[PDB]
Design a protein around this ligand. Structure first.
Ligand code: HEM
Ligand SMILES: *[C@@H]1O[C@H](CO)[C@@H](O)[C@H](O)[C@H]1NC(C)=O
Ligand SMILES: *[C@@H]1O[C@H](CO)[C@@H](O)[C@H](O)[C@H]1NC(C)=O
Ligand SMILES: *[C@@H]1O[C@H](CO)[C@@H](O)[C@H](O)[C@H]1NC(C)=O
Ligand SMILES: *[C@@H]1O[C@H](CO)[C@@H](O)[C@H](O)[C@H]1NC(C)=O
Ligand SMILES: *[C@@H]1O[C@H](CO)[C@@H](O)[C@H](O)[C@H]1NC(C)=O
Ligand SMILES: [Cl-]
Ligand SMILES: [Mg+2]
Length: 325
């Protein structure tokens, strides 16, 4: 199917409703590193087993949280290109699963959102770096640090000021302890945007005040559960206020170089001054390296999904064509 369009009616409304009750996980149900998608699956906005099509994902993030259409399209097709099965049109929101169907040849992994270094990456707020053994499960110690930062910088609530301080703390902790820490290109962008999402999308839409309480935060981050009577945001949004987060502690993209405390700036990386380069490298390097010489049906599926990806790219960038026109 085609990428869904924007919501026809984007008002705040009850999304924890009779048709979308929270249910616990059944054996085989998949949850991953994204509390948004996890919550949508656990309320039946997505299939409850955590395997979905790109169209299902885009519809769910819009309907359940009022995620904006362009952001939804870019994120979903990016994730699907690197982590999903392009023939079956299925993506796991967590671990690799036989439920996404017969795999393409190596080097494509079809690893789901749990695949480290494609979409998922280091210095997540409530998930540990892959180097430490688990990049997807809720981590209580890290959440308690989020609570502490909310107490210190947000009067007990999570807001953009808290995001700015916590984003930097997690980067500095990974620099100090993860000798494989990578913070370039696609991850450099998503790591900043994601810190705004709890303030923009987990705050009840009747308030929309950017101040997320810790009971709601835990419900989403740990239990994939909307608060009782949760209303979605009152208009479409994703990363608004990311400038506040960056401004708090501006960083350059880089990586540790096989040792702790060796953060080395990467001049080949995109940064916020070159957003089109982030798109071009994602396609020319990341996607192309997974599918260097695709067969007929895969080449077609790649080109279709790459066209959809480009719909999510901000105006002013030129589309690139790794497999011709
Ligand atoms: C539109 C499709 C979406 C996809 C494919 C997606 C995928 C992901 C992935 C792979 C991560 C892991 C990045 C990392 O920390 O390593 C992530 C993080 C995150 N996503 Fe999503 N996401 C989407 C939409 C949303 C929405 C709508 C929300 C909120 C309603 C949300 C909230 C978050 C948050 C808070 C994190 C950071 C978790 C943390 O650092 O502890 N995402 N997302
Ligand atoms: C849009 O949705 C809101 C909340 O569900 C509702 O009050 C309003 O009547 C809707 N608008 C239309 C034109 O149906
Ligand atoms: C280490 O970093 C490289 C990229 O620099 C990545 O491919 C690899 O998966 C990382 N592994 C872990 C466990 O962090
Ligand atoms: C959670 O994160 C902490 C702090 O980085 C880490 O020491 C711990 O091993 C992680 N995992 C669990 C299961 O607590
Ligand atoms: C975060 O909350 C604190 C305490 O209420 C406040 O000083 C700060 O201005 C807030 N920041 C935002 C962006 O709301
Ligand atoms: C991506 O590849 C296209 C040719 O298909 C080229 O014009 C463009 O400059 C490349 N961009 C990067 C960042 O490599
Ligand atoms: Cl929209
Ligand atoms: Mg991560």
């Amino acid at each position: 199917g085609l990428p869904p369009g924007p919501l026809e009616n984007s008002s705040a409304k009850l999304v924890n409703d009779e048709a979308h009750p929270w249910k616990p996980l059944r054996p085989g149900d998949i949850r991953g590193p994204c509390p948004g998608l996890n919550t949508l699956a656990s309320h039946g906005y997505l299939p409850r087993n955590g395997v979905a099509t790109p169209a299902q994902i885009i519809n769910a993030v819009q309907e359940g949280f009022n995620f904006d259409n362009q952001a939804a399209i870019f994120a979903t097709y990016a994730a699907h290109l690197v982590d999903g099965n392009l023939i079956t049109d299925l993506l796991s929101i967590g671990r690799k699963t036989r439920l996404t169907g017969p795999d393409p040849p190596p080097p494509a992994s079809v690893g789901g959102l749990n695949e480290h270094g494609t979409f998922e990456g280091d210095a997540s707020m409530t998930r540990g770096d892959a180097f430490f053994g688990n990049n997807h499960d809720f981590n209580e110690t890290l959440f308690e640090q989020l609570v502490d930062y909310s107490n210190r910088f947000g009067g007990g609530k999570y807001n953009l000021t808290v995001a700015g301080e916590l984003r930097f703390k997690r980067i500095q902790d990974s620099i100090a302890t993860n000798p494989n820490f990578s913070f370039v290109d696609f991850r450099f962008f998503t790591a900043y945007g994601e810190t705004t999402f709890p303030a923009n999308l987990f705050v009840d839409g009747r308030r929309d005040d950017g101040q997320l309480d810790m009971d709601a935060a835990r419900s989403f981050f740990q239990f994939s559960r909307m608060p009782d009577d949760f209303f979605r945001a009152p208009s479409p949004r994703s990363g608004t206020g990311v400038e506040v987060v960056v401004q708090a502690h501006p960083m350059q993209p880089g990586r540790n170089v096989g040792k702790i405390n060796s953060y080395t700036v990467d001049p080949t990386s995109s940064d916020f001054s070159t957003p089109c380069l982030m798109y071009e490298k994602f396609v020319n390097i990341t996607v192309k390296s997974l599918y260097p010489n695709p067969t007929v049906q895969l080449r077609k599926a790649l080109n279709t999904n790459l066209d959809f990806l480009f719909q999510g790219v901000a105006a002013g960038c030129t589309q690139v064509f790794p497999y011709g026109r």
